[PDB]
């Protein structure tokens, strides 16, 4: 596979080029929020972003080397984590706010519109502030987002656990993160310390995803919003 042959510079370039666009909400900015309409806006946005995510994933070096069945599992596992890390990245320069879309920038008080959502907002905001205090770089962000894609469902390939290829690609992204930090002038010690700091945030992103999934399921089970067939299938996977 050419992915394992890529240099670190080439891996980063590949990742950066695969980046999906920043989509807009269909928020009608002169009409009032309800729990239902806010949930509608957020899930409508997620649905459109999902199409772009699928096409992004195909461009993550080594992903199309995987079987189609494995590709499905990884995306089913990680989709909300991936949406969330994107959100937290977008929201970095907006302290106290979540930039779901350029035309949908919400504070925690607006989060209270939807029952159970403010707790999730608070976790996202805390992650964004952590990214901000760490001065997360875009090149680091794309590595982290790819790690989530490859890692989150890699230990549920069962009923004995099976995938060396995925792990080799993950190892390559580790090499790339270290390369990035070395090139940025971090000392050898700072390199391993920052590597751990960034990977530990992925534990928090998993937590948020788990909580968000239970939240979304709750909204669907209360008939608050109709979810797209895609979103229903992605949600059903959990």
């Amino acid at each position: 596979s050419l992915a394992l042959s890529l240099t670190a510079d080439q891996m980063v370039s590949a990742l950066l080029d695969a980046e999906p666009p920043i989509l807009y909400s269909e928020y009608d900015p002169t009409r009032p929020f309800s729990e239902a309409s806010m949930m509608g806006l957020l899930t409508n946005l997620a649905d459109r972003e999902l199409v772009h995510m699928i096409n992004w994933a195909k461009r993550v070096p080594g992903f199309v080397d995987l079987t189609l069945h494995d590709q499905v599992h990884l995306l089913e596992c990680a989709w909300l984590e991936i949406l969330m890390i994107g959100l937290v990245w977008r929201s970095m320069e907006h302290p106290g706010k979540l930039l779901f879309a350029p035309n949908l920038l919400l504070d925690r008080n607006q989060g209270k519109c939807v029952e159970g959502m403010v707790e999730i907002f608070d976790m996202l905001l805390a992650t964004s502030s952590r990214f901000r205090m760490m001065n997360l770089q875009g090149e680091e962000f794309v590595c982290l987002k790819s790690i989530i894609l490859l890692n989150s469902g890699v230990y549920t390939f069962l009923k004995s656990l099976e995938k060396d290829h995925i792990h080799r690609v993950l190892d390559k992204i580790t090499d790339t993160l270290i390369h990035l930090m070395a090139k940025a002038g971090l000392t050898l010690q700072q390199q391993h310390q920052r590597l751990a700091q960034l990977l530990l945030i992925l534990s928090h992103i998993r937590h948020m995803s788990n909580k968000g999934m239970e939240h979304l399921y709750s909204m669907k089970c209360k008939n608050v919003v109709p979810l797209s067939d895609l979103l229903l299938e992605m949600l059903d996977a959990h």
Partner: peptide, 9 residues
């Protein structure tokens, strides 16, 4: 399965 279809197209 929609995901399956999108991944092929």
């Amino acid at each position: 399965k929609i995901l399956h279809r999108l991944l092929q197209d």
